[PDB]
Design a protein around this ligand. Structure first.
Ligand SMILES: *[C@@H]1O[C@H](CO[C@H]2O[C@@H](C)[C@@H](O)[C@@H](O)[C@@H]2O)[C@@H](O[C@@H]2O[C@H](CO)[C@@H](O)[C@H](O)[C@H]2NC(C)=O)[C@H](O)[C@H]1NC(C)=O
Ligand SMILES: *[C@@H]1O[C@H](CO[C@H]2O[C@@H](C)[C@@H](O)[C@@H](O)[C@@H]2O)[C@@H](O[C@@H]2O[C@H](CO)[C@@H](O)[C@H](O)[C@H]2NC(C)=O)[C@H](O)[C@H]1NC(C)=O
Ligand SMILES: *[C@@H]1O[C@H](CO[C@H]2O[C@@H](C)[C@@H](O)[C@@H](O)[C@@H]2O)[C@@H](O[C@@H]2O[C@H](CO)[C@@H](O)[C@H](O)[C@H]2NC(C)=O)[C@H](O)[C@H]1NC(C)=O
Ligand SMILES: *[C@H]1O[C@H](CO[C@H]2O[C@@H](C)[C@@H](O)[C@@H](O)[C@@H]2O)[C@@H](O[C@@H]2O[C@H](CO)[C@@H](O)[C@H](O)[C@H]2NC(C)=O)[C@H](O)[C@H]1NC(C)=O
Ligand SMILES: *[C@H]1O[C@H](CO[C@H]2O[C@@H](C)[C@@H](O)[C@@H](O)[C@@H]2O)[C@@H](O[C@@H]2O[C@H](CO)[C@@H](O)[C@H](O)[C@H]2NC(C)=O)[C@H](O)[C@H]1NC(C)=O
Ligand SMILES: *[C@H]1O[C@H](CO[C@H]2O[C@@H](C)[C@@H](O)[C@@H](O)[C@@H]2O)[C@@H](O[C@@H]2O[C@H](CO)[C@@H](O)[C@H](O)[C@H]2NC(C)=O)[C@H](O)[C@H]1NC(C)=O
Ligand SMILES: *[C@@H]1O[C@H](CO)[C@@H](O)[C@H](O)[C@H]1NC(C)=O
Ligand SMILES: *[C@@H]1O[C@H](CO)[C@@H](O)[C@H](O)[C@H]1NC(C)=O
Ligand SMILES: *[C@@H]1O[C@H](CO)[C@@H](O)[C@H](O)[C@H]1NC(C)=O
Ligand SMILES: [Cl-]
Ligand SMILES: [Cl-]
Ligand SMILES: [Cl-]
Ligand SMILES: [Cl-]
Ligand SMILES: [Cl-]
Ligand SMILES: [Cl-]
Ligand SMILES: [K+]
Lengths: 263, 263, 263
């Protein structure tokens, strides 16, 4: 077949997909991967070394404009409860009615005013917690229980140049340009606070690669503590002040990690 | 009013009740009880002393014949899924559809053959775990976290004289006659194994009252360990062999204690 | 000599044997085995690695029908005290009168009714505790005191196809077919509960071989804890529910391990 005929048919090998569908991805082949990876992780069968893991504050928002009803990058995407419900059918298509109601139960008990954006925000958090944040935190817990140093970050700076609208917040993919040092180029109209943030992240990442320890040692920086089971310390990355916090998304992750897999 | 007019109307002060309805019971009166008792328990505001707490293996079965459809003391009460569902509506009348589906989800994932009695047993366990066993275990955990010795038992002997049918098992109320020593009377046709069981329970209860420690010290008995948070050791009471076990109904109680109150 | 003449004479090289006689077995040869193996075990002179060890609930019953008087696979084998006594002479032929009375003393203090099967059961337990269970537990204790992980199981499921009679219980040899996965073959008329039990044992054994840890990680299974001196946790294997228990046959093994060797 010509490549194009293959590419044209890939979307359709599945009876329904979502904005996050991975139709052709890694499998347990008995070669690269010798067993189901959740078993290897759980029983400590992996390279023993240091890791640096993290996520962005609004991981799930980018995906909402690729099919959730009522959402648009060109307006504030205020949706109703009915829209939120239709939105869960878009992101959880093979999932039982009970499963989808369990999501709604967990994410719509509001604190508290009748804010118009309640349902818009809840959907972005559903999608980002399920697909990115709770699995990164569980991976880091399980990895670190076998004795190696791990360091977790929560990236919470929205780029001053971001071409997507404000309601999408600190989107998935938009820490990358800070990691590779693009705001170090003054000619590019990032802010001064972003130059300093990128410079500090670049130093932490290079120190982690060179020395296994993602510190910034020269500029009275917050010290980045290892992430352990029990305390679960992580470091927030932002232009204002870096903080050590604990137990990121604790109540949400208990839902996705210990209950939802049963559904 | 004459007493009879009061008694006749008590059943009806509530728009629907269940076999377990307590229409007139303890309240927070600012006198006997100075605050909501869950607050006092949680914050350690109670008499500091030893406690002995326990439950019977089939606490919920006695209640099923007072209104769950398909149940009868005069047949084996095999029910269907539909009956099980109607049964939850009888025992959880003010509870949302989602709440009742959550019960069914948690109790009907079977291990495993298509046993006819699956749903009959699941209903007795729902009712006994929610109303008796998980709350006794939570009370004992919370009490013991403030530093006092607590001892938990699981009573699992069905009286040889029990006039209710076999499917009801080790029913609610039927440890009482062992505690008060009725099987010590040989004229009454309990078995010899029941005489010995009652004699040992009577000694443990009297030792607990006299000395704060419910041991039977003279007859090479299993030593009854204190119940602590963390290990949650309890002692099984039966005619065959007494065992030390841990974490009674762990998976079920996590459901009733940490999830169900939200529903 | 022709092989047959050798085989014909093997039974007779010993002045009396028992159903468990090993007339030609391992010896201390100064080659395969460099010293008495109890010395090597006691002083830690063995390969340092993980072990998985376990026993079946009724190890000794299979042997009773190969010579104990009153026993038969074709009836319920209720025996008398005199039969029990003759039975000890069959299984402990070189042992002093005092030694045999010590066995009877330890196993016949009954709890408690005058059950007809008291002596039948006591004999199966004598033979299974002395020959299999207490030595497996002592081996596992002594091995694990030198620092390696060990996991102990107690197998308590009687195969639905077992052609021996009910009184023999969970016999010696009858876990093997669960380990090798024979109940996975639906065409063979094991029950559904046995298919699931075998599937779980097969996974635990393969995980132990591959990873040194006999967990079943995917199906909310009971976690199998290491067996340590002090706590002596073991895992029960059955079709109903898997339990973590402690100190298997504690009172019996103290008899066989610390007293009987003196006799
Ligand atoms: C924000 O936009 C969405 C997206 O749809 C629209 O894009 C707009 C910016 C505008 O150009 C509009 O014409 C275009 O259709 C609106 O949702 C849509 O609403 C329409 C019209 O009512 C529905 O019939 C559509 O099915 C629905 N589209 C999708 C993909 O759901 C949305 O209402 C609007 N929200 C606002 C203004 O708050
Ligand atoms: C076990 O009994 C129940 C209870 O109802 C019955 O009590 C029986 C022992 C017998 O005397 C019967 O006539 C009496 O009604 C049975 O459930 C009942 O089934 C009937 C007839 O089909 C229904 O129409 C009833 O509504 C229902 N009663 C209740 C309270 O649910 C039940 O089927 C039976 N179960 C068995 C035999 O397994
Ligand atoms: C259960 O059987 C044993 C075994 O002996 C017998 O096998 C039976 C099923 C039957 O065919 C019987 O004829 C055969 O001998 C019984 O013990 C035997 O009892 C006999 C007759 O009284 C004694 O004289 C034998 O020596 C004795 N055999 C052995 C090996 O001990 C046994 O009594 C019987 N038990 C029951 C029925 O409870
Ligand atoms: C994988 O197997 C079938 C494949 O069915 C598919 O045919 C393909 C060539 C492709 O075009 C694909 O879109 C189409 O779905 C799946 O069967 C589907 O199941 C649905 C019900 O959900 C039925 O309606 C059809 O048989 C078929 N779908 C449609 C839209 O026609 C099957 O679901 C799948 N296996 C999985 C998901 O595990
Ligand atoms: C307590 O207040 C009312 C009381 O309504 C009741 O009138 C009583 C005298 C008594 O007979 C009782 O059985 C009757 O219910 C409750 O109002 C009920 O709510 C339902 C809907 O669930 C309506 O149908 C009625 O107003 C009434 N019930 C019936 C069966 O007619 C109210 O529910 C209750 N408060 C609670 C439960 O907190
Ligand atoms: C090993 O040495 C002798 C061997 O005596 C045996 O002669 C063999 C060829 C064989 O047939 C065997 O069955 C026979 O016993 C043992 O001597 C026995 O001791 C008993 C008393 O218990 C005497 O009666 C005999 O000398 C002989 N037995 C019989 C039945 O005739 C000796 O016991 C043994 N050593 C051990 C057990 O350590
Ligand atoms: C540290 O501070 C200096 C000057 O005070 C600055 O120029 C540099 O960017 C900082 N370095 C890092 C690694 O953040
Ligand atoms: C202890 O055992 C004796 C005799 O061995 C018995 O009569 C008595 O009932 C037992 N006592 C208790 C307190 O269980
Ligand atoms: C786990 O459960 C699945 C389905 O719920 C079942 O088919 C499989 O046999 C189980 N696996 C193991 C290893 O026990
Ligand atoms: Cl709704
Ligand atoms: Cl904390
Ligand atoms: Cl249904
Ligand atoms: Cl435990
Ligand atoms: Cl005697
Ligand atoms: Cl113990
Ligand atoms: K739930």
């Amino acid at each position: 077949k010509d490549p194009q005929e293959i590419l044209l048919n890939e979307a359709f090998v599945v009876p329904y997909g979502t904005p996050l569908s991975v139709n052709f991805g890694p499998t347990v082949d008995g070669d690269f991967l010798t067993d189901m990876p959740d078993i290897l992780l759980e029983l400590g069968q992996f390279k023993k070394t240091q890791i640096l893991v993290g996520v962005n504050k609004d991981e799930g928002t980018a995906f909402l404009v690729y099919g959730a009803p009522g959402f648009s990058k060109d307006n504030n995407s205020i949706i109703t409860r009915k829209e939120f419900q239709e939105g869960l059918k878009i992101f959880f298509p093979g999932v039982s009615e009970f499963g989808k109601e369990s999501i709604l139960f967990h994410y719509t008990d509001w604190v508290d005013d009748q804010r118009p954006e309640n349902y818009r925000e809840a959907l972005g958090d559903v999608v980002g917690d399920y697909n990115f944040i709770c699995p990164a935190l569980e991976f880091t817990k399980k990895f670190s229980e076998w004795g190696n140093n791990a360091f977790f970050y929560y990236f919470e700076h929205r780029s001053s140049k971001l071409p997507w609208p404000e309601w999408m917040g600190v989107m998935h993919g938009y820490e990358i340009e800070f990691v590779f040092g693009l705001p170090l180029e003054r000619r590019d109209q990032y802010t001064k606070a972003e130059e300093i943030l990128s410079r500090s992240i670049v130093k932490r990442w290079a120190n982690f690669a060179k020395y296994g320890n993602p510190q910034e040692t020269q500029n009275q920086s917050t010290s980045w503590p290892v992430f352990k089971s029990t305390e679960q310390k992580y470091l927030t990355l932002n232009t204002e002040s870096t903080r050590i916090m604990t137990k990121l998304r604790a109540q949400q992750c208990r839902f996705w990690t210990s209950f939802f897999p049963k559904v």
